[PDB]
Design a protein around this nucleic acid. Structure first.
Ligand SMILES: [Mg+2]
Ligand SMILES: [Mg+2]
Ligand SMILES: [Mg+2]
Lengths: 834, 49, 49
RNA sequence: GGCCAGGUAGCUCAGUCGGUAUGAGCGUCCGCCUGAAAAGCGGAAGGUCGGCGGUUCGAUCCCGCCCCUGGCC
């Protein structure tokens, strides 16, 4: 879209007008372009060839028959008294055409040695070359046919084709539309090398043609944003005429195919000056040419034979019969130049950049003209580019330029396209660059790029040229001085940053959670925000599940994955499947990223004027229109949790491993969490815990549902955990332990409870009854023998009692144990074992 | 300073949030975070996103 | 496949109706056994979380 | 955007323009074997041939639309 291809010979030619003898190596030219801000995507040298590669004329053709595809035994005149008999398989040439012949002993790019061959029962004393085989172009369906008069038979092929040239592929930034031509790039090189520039669009290079009257009746609606519209006829062109080889070659090297002299000239001048041109068959124009907007539902068939559905924002060129062109994009087939066109009306117009951009994007037409208008075309060279086209076409097509000219320049007519002047201090570029440039550096560089600078003491008044609409503010001028003086002269000094506060508590906690999970055996992945197709249908989630309320992307890379992630599990499970499916069956993955949980339908906020600061209410409105995006931590486990070794066969992943992942995240966050049984898909309802911080729910953990595992292709027993880190408050505890020097008392209590009673509820009841003497409690036995009873279990806890100021007796600890026993009997219905 | 209907913004292909013309998208850069910092914090600002 | 061409239409129509009845009985039985599994997963595999 | 090429087992890929993909290599499982393994030998399981419809007694195969990669401009 921003590509600009041009040969170095053409680029050197324009620079050399004002700098005779200027010539640089392609390596130095590449560095200079990069140093001033022009990215060189590729440097493609033509050829090279060696040996007998000459121009020939096909004098006779013999159609060798009897084979699958037609073969031609050709007699080629290479400029001597002995015609060479060459076999060829191409069919895009006739007797009398000029071709490029590689004779035996020649070398073609790359390393292809040419010699006499015995093909199709004949003797091939050479080879007729194609554009691709000569490294001149990409055409390979046929051989290269030079236009008549390009060269005589026997001329050096490398010289006629200009294989010593070098093609430069540039990527022009959208702020330098003036560089999408040989004119602008030559001006840039003239600035970089401090040379005198002769503008190829000036009146000296393009002397104006006569203006004796109107060329065609024109009605322009100014609401379409057109700044200029010029018309000049060229009558009496020869339909049999063809563009000379020097013109077709420069078009080919610039990436444009030659068709007819009328169109070839318009493309050539567009590449030379930067003003897109179009040739209309004047004999097919019916009445007054009108420039207006397209009406609703109006259609137009462009010159490629495709019907275009137009919009009311599209600028059209119409007559009394039909639409003549899509303003600034592509002409129509009605007034298109054909093989029998004798009278041509040339169009030179300056369209609105924004209107052309919207039209060419809606119709998917990034033409050579469109991608130049949307980057602003110099409105001052329209007649210059027009006269350049007329005089060139009349010379090569044997036509005659009409002395008539229509030049609509607005209402009222604009005779000066100068942008508004800019006031800037003379030392402003010095301050931004941190360099003390020599005296007059800012004024000299701004005058090189075509601006007029006047001095008012210490303040400069700069008026940029018409081809530089990117220069509106003093900062735009600063870039011009800094880039032409070279950014390498800017020194390296460290800024005076104030004392900072470092990482926030949330940023610090995110590191600690990542370290703890990694040191515990989990492998971090980068979760993709795009959800897999129908993953919630695989999970069996209800239609009203909050996780289904997703945010969808209009243009995703995969159309079946438009929704954004409300949970981190689908990305982890997809990464889990990748590892397991590739031989890594024992894996524990984790991720820390945000989710997208909207609270309403996608509602946007209008454009706030950027000329001021948005008010605090407008900032709060922009935040309320965005979906909630909290930080989540999640993990998935499958296979062996502990690997096998000399200790034993290892331990497969169980739900407790996911529960332990919760306590690892909790300890890393320095918060206390509680786990409670919950039924929450996609987890196993009997092996799923809901994690709470105090009384706020922060996530779930456990083993996944066996049905979800089957439908998702997951390993059996797969476990998962997901927590909302934003729902976990950042804690900064300040403990003050009192280490008691007195001995402890060790006792064990065995309590029998119902099977559904959580072991933590019993421990919490024991602590609540034991009091402050209880220093530690730990479960170490869960017995479900037949002497316990059906649906009942026995729990044995190790108790450690210690007083802070005395030595306890066994009765003192037993009194605390008995009080703990009564508390368990009252809260969880525990019965003392016995 | 992205101009609308311009190659400096139109060519910047962005994951836009459905439906069309919602003025909501997936960020192509963390520069909007730099905009929020200038609106929220006092000068001078030395921030990394 | 090895049957004569004149007999593939009649015999093939009776083969499909037979295997569709077996496939029909299998699909609903698969759903019934999966429903019983989903109904008997909470209690038969419950743990102390 | 047209015309081709493709999406096939857990992985990497063959192969079929109508009734069995007598699929390969590796991966999974069983036996002989070992204290337990692997290799070796002997064997099995697993694909609804990209998705949704259509034609047909019957579609990986033919038709339409759509999704995803490659070639091509
Ligand atoms: Mg600039
Ligand atoms: Mg595969
Ligand atoms: Mg074995």
């Amino acid at each position: 879209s921003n590509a600009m291809r041009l040969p170095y010979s053409w680029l050197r030619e324009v620079v050399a007008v004002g700098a005779s003898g200027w010539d640089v190596t392609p390596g130095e030219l590449e560095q200079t372009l990069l140093r001033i801000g022009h990215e060189v995507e590729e440097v493609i040298p033509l050829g090279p060839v060696d040996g007998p590669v000459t121009v020939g004329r096909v004098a006779d053709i013999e159609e060798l028959t009897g084979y699958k595809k037609p073969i031609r035994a050709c007699a080629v005149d290479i400029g001597d008294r002995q015609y060479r008999e060459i076999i060829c398989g191409a069919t895009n040439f006739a007797v009398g055409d000029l071709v490029v012949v590689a004779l035996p002993g020649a070398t073609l790019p790359g390393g292809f040695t040419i010699s006499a061959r015995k093909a199709y029962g004949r003797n091939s004393d050479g080879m007729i070359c194609s554009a691709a085989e000569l490294n001149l172009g990409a055409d390979h369906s046929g051989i290269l046919v030079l236009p008549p008069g390009a060269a005589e038979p026997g001329a050096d092929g490398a010289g006629v084709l200009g294989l010593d040239d070098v093609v430069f592929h540039l990527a022009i930034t959208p702020d330098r539309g003036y560089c999408m031509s040989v004119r602008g790039l030559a001006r840039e090189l003239a600035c970089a090398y401090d040379l005198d520039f002769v503008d190829p669009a000036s009146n000296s290079r393009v002397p104006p043609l006569p203006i004796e009257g109107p060329a065609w009746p024109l009605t322009v609606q100014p609401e379409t944003g057109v700044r200029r519209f010029a018309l000049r006829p060229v009558i009496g062109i020869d339909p049999a005429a063809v563009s000379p080889w020097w013109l077709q070659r420069r078009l080919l090297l610039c990436g444009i195919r030659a068709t007819c002299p009328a169109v070839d000239v318009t493309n050539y001048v567009m590449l030379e000056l930067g003003h897109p041109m179009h040739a209309h068959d004047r004999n097919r124009i019916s009445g007054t040419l009108g420039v207006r907007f397209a009406r609703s539902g109006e259609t137009a068939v462009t010159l490629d034979g495709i019907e275009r559905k137009l919009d009311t924002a599209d600028v059209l060129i119409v007559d009394d019969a039909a639409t003549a062109a899509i303003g600034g994009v592509m002409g129509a087939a009605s007034t298109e130049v054909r093989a029998d066109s004798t009278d041509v009306l040339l169009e030179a117009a300056i369209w609105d950049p924004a209107a052309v951009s919207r039209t060419q994007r809606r119709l998917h037409l990034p033409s050579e003209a469109a991608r130049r208008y949307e980057r602003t075309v110099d409105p001052a060279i329209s007649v210059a580019a027009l006269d350049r086209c007329a005089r060139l076409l009349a010379d090569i097509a044997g036509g005659e330029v009409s002395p008539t000219l229509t030049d609509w320049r607005g209402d009222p007519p604009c005779d000066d396209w100068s942008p508004p002047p800019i006031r800037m201090g003379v030392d402003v570029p010095d301050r931004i660059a941190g360099v003390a440039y020599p005296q007059g550096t800012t004024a000299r560089r701004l005058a090189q790029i075509g601006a007029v600078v006047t001095h008012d003491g210490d303040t400069l008044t700069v008026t940029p040229p018409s081809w530089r609409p990117d220069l509106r503010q003093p900062a735009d001028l600063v870039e011009e001085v800094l880039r032409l003086e070279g950014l390498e002269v800017i020194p390296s000094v460290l800024p005076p940053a104030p004392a900072g506060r470092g990482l926030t508590a949330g940023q610090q906690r995110r590191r600690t959670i990542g370290r703890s999970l990694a040191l515990s055996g989990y492998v971090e992945i980068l979760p993709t925000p795009f959800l897999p197709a129908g993953v919630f249908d695989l999970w069996g989630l209800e239609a009203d599940d909050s996780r289904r309320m997703t945010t969808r992307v209009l243009n995703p890379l995969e159309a079946d994955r438009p929704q954004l992630a409300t949970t981190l599990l689908p990305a982890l499970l997809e990464a889990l499947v990748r590892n397991v499916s590739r031989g890594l069956v024992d894996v524990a993955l984790f991720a820390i990223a945000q989710v997208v949980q909207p609270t309403e339908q996608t509602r946007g906020v209008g454009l706030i004027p950027v000329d001021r600061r948005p008010t605090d209410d407008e900032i709060a409105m922009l935040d309320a229109s965005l979906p909630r995006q909290p930080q989540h931590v999640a993990a998935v486990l499958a296979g062996l949790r502990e690997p096998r070794g000399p200790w034993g066969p290892g331990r497969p992943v169980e739900a407790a491993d996911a529960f332990e992942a919760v306590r690892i995240i909790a300890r890393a966050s320095r918060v206390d969490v509680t786990l409670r049984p919950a039924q929450y898909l996609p987890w196993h309802p009997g092996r799923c815990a809901q994690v709470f911080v105090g009384e706020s729910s922060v996530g779930h953990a456990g083993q996944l549902h066996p049905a979800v595992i089957e439908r998702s292709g997951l390993p059996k027993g797969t476990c998962a955990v997901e927590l909302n880190l934003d729902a976990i408050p950042c804690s900064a505890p300040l403990p003050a332990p009192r280490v008691s020097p007195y001995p402890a008392v060790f006792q064990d209590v065995s309590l029998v409870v119902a099977a559904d009673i959580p072991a933590q509820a019993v421990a919490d009841a024991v602590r609540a009854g034991a009091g402050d003497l209880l220093e530690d409690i730990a479960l170490f036995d869960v017995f479900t023998g037949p002497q316990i009873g059906e649906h009942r279990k026995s729990l044995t806890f190790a108790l450690r009692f210690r007083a802070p100021d005395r030595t306890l007796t066994e009765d003192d600890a037993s009194a605390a144990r008995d009080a703990a026993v009564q508390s368990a009997a009252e809260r969880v219905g525990a019965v003392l074992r016995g | 300073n992205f101009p609308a209907d311009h190659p400096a913004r139109g060519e910047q292909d962005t994951f836009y949030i459905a439906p069309e013309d919602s003025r909501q998208l997936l960020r192509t850069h963390t520069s909007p975070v730099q905009i929020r910092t200038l609106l929220a914090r006092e000068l001078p600002v030395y921030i990394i996103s | 496949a090895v049957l004569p061409k004149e007999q593939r239409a009649e015999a093939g129509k009776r083969v499909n109706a037979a295997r569709n009845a077996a496939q029909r009985s299998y699909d609903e039985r698969l759903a019934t056994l999966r429903a019983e599994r989903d109904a008997a997963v909470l209690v038969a595999e419950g743990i102390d979380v």
